[PDB]
Design a protein around this ligand. Sequence first.
Ligand SMILES: *[C@@H]1O[C@H](CO)[C@@H](O[C@@H]2O[C@H](CO)[C@@H](O)[C@H](O)[C@H]2NC(C)=O)[C@H](O)[C@H]1NC(C)=O
Ligand SMILES: *[C@@H]1O[C@H](CO)[C@@H](O)[C@H](O)[C@H]1NC(C)=O
Ligand SMILES: *[C@@H]1O[C@H](CO)[C@@H](O)[C@H](O)[C@H]1NC(C)=O
Ligand SMILES: [Pb+2]
Ligand SMILES: [Pb+2]
Length: 188
Amino acid sequence: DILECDYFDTVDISAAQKLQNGSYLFEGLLVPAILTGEYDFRILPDDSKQKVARHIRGCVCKLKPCVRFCCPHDHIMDNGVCYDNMSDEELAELDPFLNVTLDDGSVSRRHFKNELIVQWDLPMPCDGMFYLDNREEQDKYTLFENGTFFRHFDRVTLRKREYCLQHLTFADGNATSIRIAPHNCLIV
Ligand SMILES: *[C@@H]1O[C@H](CO)[C@@H](O[C@@H]2O[C@H](CO)[C@@H](O)[C@H](O)[C@H]2NC(C)=O)[C@H](O)[C@H]1NC(C)=O
Ligand SMILES: *[C@@H]1O[C@H](CO)[C@@H](O)[C@H](O)[C@H]1NC(C)=O
Ligand SMILES: *[C@@H]1O[C@H](CO)[C@@H](O)[C@H](O)[C@H]1NC(C)=O
Ligand SMILES: [Pb+2]
Ligand SMILES: [Pb+2]
């Protein structure tokens, strides 16, 4: 609906402050009216449309970089399910940084929540996703600032409809740590 904006580059802005000149103030970001629009549908895993309450969405990813998350910013992915159970301790010890490859080909460390706009209301890419642990040689990947995801093993490029990132608990030998990991669909 929003001119020249893929649905997966949008965020729900119904809670944003609607200004006088018609533009919006979304979490400190000025969103021009042209980048906004009403939606009465939300794409689903199968790329079909479903109905939802007439709400206003904004194409914020064209204004500030976005991170394609699987769930709300403070949830953890537990074996493919969004789980809101992070203790204050985990929230403090978790690694909030993502390595994003920029257009000049360089790598930049970015805080997932403060330096990027977390998209969490998008449909789950599929049921039973597997996750990549880039500490293993076959699990390496590249995450571009523009949203493109590249899986090294089979050199396939995934768009925002096919992957999502989320905090996840990894085993540290005989300990445990939380880091953000990408989730892909095995057969989809
Ligand atoms: C997002 O960035 C990626 C990587 O910078 C773009 O995809 C690359 O496009 C070049 C163009 O010649 C290809 O040679 C590369 O092989 C592509 N890399 C991958 C991993 O696909 C992508 O086009 C950008 N998306 C947008 C909308 O600009
Ligand atoms: C709306 O007002 C803000 C400041 O209050 C201004 O920065 C912005 O450019 C205005 N919107 C447009 C479309 O000019
Ligand atoms: C980003 O790169 C650092 C340094 O190589 C690495 O230790 C860290 O695991 C990476 N971050 C994520 C979320 O994979
Ligand atoms: Pb826990
Ligand atoms: Pb693996």
